[PDB]
Design a protein around this motif. Structure first.
Motif, short mmCIF file in Angstrom:
data_model
loop_
_atom_site.label_atom_id
_atom_site.label_comp_id
_atom_site.label_asym_id
_atom_site.label_seq_id
_atom_site.Cartn_x
_atom_site.Cartn_y
_atom_site.Cartn_z
N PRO A 50 0.63 -1.14 0.06
CA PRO A 50 -0.16 -0.01 -0.08
C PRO A 50 0.86 1.19 0.20
O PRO A 50 1.94 1.23 0.57
CB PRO A 50 -0.98 -0.10 1.47
CG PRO A 50 -0.70 -1.55 1.51
CD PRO A 50 0.44 -2.22 1.08
N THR A 51 0.30 2.31 -0.77
CA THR A 51 1.11 3.54 -0.93
C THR A 51 1.54 4.30 0.38
O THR A 51 2.69 5.02 0.87
CB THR A 51 0.45 4.52 -2.02
OG1 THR A 51 0.50 3.95 -3.17
CG2 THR A 51 1.08 5.84 -2.15
N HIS A 52 0.42 4.15 1.38
CA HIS A 52 0.66 4.65 2.81
C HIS A 52 1.73 4.12 3.45
O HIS A 52 2.15 4.56 4.55
CB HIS A 52 -0.68 4.74 3.48
CG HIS A 52 -1.23 3.12 3.99
ND1 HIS A 52 -2.21 2.77 3.14
CD2 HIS A 52 -0.90 2.65 4.89
CE1 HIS A 52 -2.57 1.48 4.08
NE2 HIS A 52 -1.68 1.54 4.96
N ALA A 53 2.25 2.95 3.09
CA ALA A 53 3.64 2.29 3.79
C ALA A 53 4.84 3.62 3.81
O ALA A 53 5.86 3.14 4.18
CB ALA A 53 3.86 1.11 3.11
N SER A 54 4.70 4.68 2.50
CA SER A 54 5.77 5.58 2.48
C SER A 54 7.14 4.82 1.89
O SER A 54 8.34 4.94 2.88
CB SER A 54 5.81 6.53 3.67
OG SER A 54 4.54 6.98 3.79
N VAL A 55 7.22 4.08 1.26
CA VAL A 55 8.63 3.27 0.98
C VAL A 55 9.54 4.44 0.55
O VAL A 55 9.36 5.47 -0.36
CB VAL A 55 8.20 2.35 -0.42
CG1 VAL A 55 9.70 1.60 -0.94
CG2 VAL A 55 7.17 1.28 -0.17
N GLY A 56 10.61 4.34 1.15
CA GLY A 56 12.04 5.02 0.68
C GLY A 56 13.07 4.62 -0.06
O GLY A 56 12.75 3.45 -0.96
N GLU A 57 14.32 4.61 0.22
CA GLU A 57 15.39 4.45 -0.48
C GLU A 57 15.95 3.16 -0.06
O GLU A 57 16.57 2.49 -0.86
CB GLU A 57 16.55 5.65 -0.56
CG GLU A 57 16.45 6.80 -1.17
CD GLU A 57 15.87 6.76 -2.47
OE1 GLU A 57 14.79 7.19 -2.95
OE2 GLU A 57 16.55 6.05 -3.25
N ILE A 58 15.46 2.68 1.22
CA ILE A 58 16.07 1.50 1.99
C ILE A 58 14.57 0.81 2.48
O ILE A 58 13.91 1.63 2.99
CB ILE A 58 17.05 1.73 2.80
CG1 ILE A 58 18.34 2.27 2.16
CG2 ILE A 58 17.35 0.41 3.79
CD1 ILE A 58 19.50 2.77 3.16
N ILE A 59 14.57 -0.37 2.56
CA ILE A 59 13.30 -0.87 3.09
C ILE A 59 13.96 -2.28 3.81
O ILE A 59 14.93 -2.84 3.50
CB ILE A 59 12.44 -1.19 2.05
CG1 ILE A 59 10.84 -1.92 2.73
CG2 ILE A 59 12.77 -2.26 1.15
CD1 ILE A 59 9.59 -1.73 1.78
N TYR A 60 13.18 -2.86 4.84
CA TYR A 60 13.61 -4.15 5.33
C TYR A 60 12.64 -5.16 4.82
O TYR A 60 11.31 -5.22 4.84
CB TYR A 60 13.77 -4.26 6.87
CG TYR A 60 15.00 -3.60 7.65
CD1 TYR A 60 15.51 -2.37 6.88
CD2 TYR A 60 15.77 -4.49 8.37
CE1 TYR A 60 16.73 -2.07 7.52
CE2 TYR A 60 16.93 -3.99 8.86
CZ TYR A 60 17.45 -2.89 8.75
OH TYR A 60 18.48 -2.40 8.81
N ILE A 61 13.36 -6.17 4.35
CA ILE A 61 12.51 -7.41 3.63
C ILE A 61 13.15 -8.54 4.58
O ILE A 61 14.03 -9.08 4.58
CB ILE A 61 13.12 -7.52 2.20
CG1 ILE A 61 12.60 -6.28 1.41
CG2 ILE A 61 12.30 -8.93 1.68
CD1 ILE A 61 11.20 -5.75 1.39
N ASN A 62 11.86 -9.23 5.50
CA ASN A 62 12.49 -10.28 6.40
C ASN A 62 13.40 -9.84 7.24
O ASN A 62 14.44 -10.72 7.30
CB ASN A 62 12.54 -11.67 5.51
CG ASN A 62 11.22 -12.05 4.84
OD1 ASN A 62 9.98 -11.74 5.17
ND2 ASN A 62 11.28 -12.88 3.89
N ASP A 63 13.46 -8.72 7.64
CA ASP A 63 14.49 -8.33 8.39
C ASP A 63 15.96 -7.95 7.91
O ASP A 63 17.09 -8.09 8.69
CB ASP A 63 14.60 -9.01 9.71
CG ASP A 63 13.35 -8.51 10.81
OD1 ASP A 63 13.41 -7.42 11.19
OD2 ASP A 63 12.54 -9.39 11.05
N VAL A 64 16.10 -8.13 6.56
CA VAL A 64 17.25 -7.62 5.79
C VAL A 64 17.23 -6.42 5.31
O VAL A 64 16.24 -6.07 4.47
CB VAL A 64 17.12 -9.07 4.80
CG1 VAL A 64 18.73 -8.44 3.80
CG2 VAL A 64 17.52 -10.27 5.38
N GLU A 65 18.29 -5.72 5.60
CA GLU A 65 18.43 -4.25 5.00
C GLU A 65 18.27 -4.47 3.44
O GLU A 65 19.44 -5.21 3.11
CB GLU A 65 19.52 -3.36 5.57
CG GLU A 65 19.58 -2.03 4.96
CD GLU A 65 20.85 -1.24 5.62
OE1 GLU A 65 21.70 -1.82 5.97
OE2 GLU A 65 20.96 -0.11 5.13
#
Length: 182
Positions: free
Chosen positions: A39-54
């Motif tokens: 969802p767009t309201h997650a406000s994705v930036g330049e870095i995200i955590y995927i299953n706790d991996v940077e």
């Protein structure tokens, strides 16, 4: 318990990750290659955590329709070392109503959660948190904080991602095949 849950489980086990942004933890659907939705309201930036991996975000696009109205879907390309199973052939081509849908969630808070939501209405326009939004699906289940990004399926189709509720109804943004042509 039945073929609805069977299809939902098959999507959750291979095509979801836990996405964390500064706005919280979300169910994130992988669609093909390194491309996922949130969802767009997650406000994705330049870095995200995927299953706790940077994880570096290689591209992110908040979708809008050709009336320049919010659709509440962000498409993300992840700098991940692994591809998703390609599930684009399970996406509907057109806006539609559905029977017998399941909403499936996988987070720290709600692991392995499956909700039979029943009949899904092509609702269309919704004022979502004050933002005019199009292509909204509606179901009569009291969905709660923590279910955003949840995957909405029927037997054979991945039809949407949960984006909000009003305490009595839940709302999903449509997924259409045309969003993921390459």
């Amino acid at each position: 318990m039945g073929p609805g849950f069977d299809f939902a489980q098959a999507i959750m086990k291979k095509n979801t990750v836990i996405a964390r942004t500064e706005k919280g933890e979300f169910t994130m659907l992988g669609v093909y290659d390194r491309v996922a939705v949130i969802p767009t309201h997650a406000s994705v930036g330049e870095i995200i955590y995927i299953n706790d991996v940077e994880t570096r975000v290689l591209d992110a696009c908040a979708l809008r329709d050709l009336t320049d109205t919010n659709l509440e879907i962000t498409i993300v390309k992840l700098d991940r070392n692994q591809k998703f199973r390609d599930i684009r052939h399970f996406l509907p081509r057109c806006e539609d109503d559905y029977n017998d849908a399941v909403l499936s969630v996988h987070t720290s808070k709600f692991p392995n959660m499956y909700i039979p939501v029943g009949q899904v209405t092509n609702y269309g326009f919704l004022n979502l948190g004050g933002t005019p939004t199009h292509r909204i699906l509606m179901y009569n289940f009291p969905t709660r904080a923590g279910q955003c990004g949840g995957v909405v399926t029927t037997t054979g189709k991945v039809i949407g991602i949960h984006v909000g509720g009003n305490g009595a109804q839940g709302f999903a943004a449509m997924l259409l095949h045309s969003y993921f042509t390459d």
